[PDB]
Amino acid sequence: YFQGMAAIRKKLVIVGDGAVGKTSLLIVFSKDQFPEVYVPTVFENYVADIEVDGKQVELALWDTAGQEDYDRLRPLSYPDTDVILMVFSIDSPDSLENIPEKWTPEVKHFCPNVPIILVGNKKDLRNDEHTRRELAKMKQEPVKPEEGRDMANRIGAFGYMETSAKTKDGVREVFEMATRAALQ
Numbered sequence: 001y002f003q004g005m006a007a008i009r010k011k012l013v014i015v016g017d018g019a020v021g022k023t024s025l026l027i028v029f030s031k032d033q034f035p036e037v038y039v040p041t042v043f044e045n046y047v048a049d050i051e052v053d054g055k056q057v058e059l060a061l062w063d064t065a066g067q068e069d070y071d072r073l074r075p076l077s078y079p080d081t082d083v084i085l086m087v088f089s090i091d092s093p094d095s096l097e098n099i100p101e102k103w104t105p106e107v108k109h110f111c112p113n114v115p116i117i118l119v120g121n122k123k124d125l126r127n128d129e130h131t132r133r134e135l136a137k138m139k140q141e142p143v144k145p146e147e148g149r150d151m152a153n154r155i156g157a158f159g160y161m162e163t164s165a166k167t168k169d170g171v172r173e174v175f176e177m178a179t180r181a182a183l184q
């Protein structure tokens with residue numbers, strides 16, 4: 001008896017360093033497409049339909065960015081948030097360092113009791129030869145899975161998830177988990 005069942009409305013906010021792939025993640029989830037050209041700073045206003053554990057959910061997707069007006073509209077994004085996606089890039093150890101240094105303090109300040117899913121995006125670059133060579137000149141290497149999991153443990157995240165928006169792998173499961181968290 002699913003027909004006519006009222007949908008549940010929930011709000012998701014996605015944050016993280018510039019160029020880690022926040023907007024690309026939202027477009028892959030919403031449209032089942034990895035865009036490569038003409039991608040905006042933030043994804044269009046979007047409410048996604050998702051069915052999880054038998055519940056019909058309408059999930060509002062709030063994208064954020066990091067300069068000028070976006071520095072100001074970002075803190076205004078947090079009211080009434082039900083789940084946070086906090087993103088770093090596996091090809092950027094620096095973006096992972098900003099998880100405890102910047103993003104977790106900001107989210108705890110404005111969204112104290114809201115579940116956080118820590119997302120390591122660009123997992124397709126972990127074993128990319130060119131990426132590994134560029135990071136090697138800085139004596140760095142791509143983030144290891146256990147390093148992402150460790151950071152998720154440290155910040156009390158609802159979960160740790162890895163994605164490639166480029167291949168689309170893992171993206172559905174991130175938003176399914178976020179929806180389960182939002183329903184809590």
Ligand SMILES: Nc1nc2c(ncn2[C@@H]2O[C@H](COP(=O)(O)OP(=O)(O)O)[C@@H](O)[C@H]2O)c(=O)[nH]1
Nearest residue numbers: 018019020021022023024121122123164165166
């Ligand atoms: N290789 C790879 N590139 C990605 C991935 N996700 C995003 N990108 C690229 O990373 C850049 C930043 O993507 P964007 O979605 O604009 O990042 P945002 O600033 O966090 O919204 C673009 O060149 C994307 O094509 C991914 O999973 N793998």
Ligand SMILES: [Mg+2]
Nearest residue numbers: 022023041042
């Ligand atoms: Mg963006």
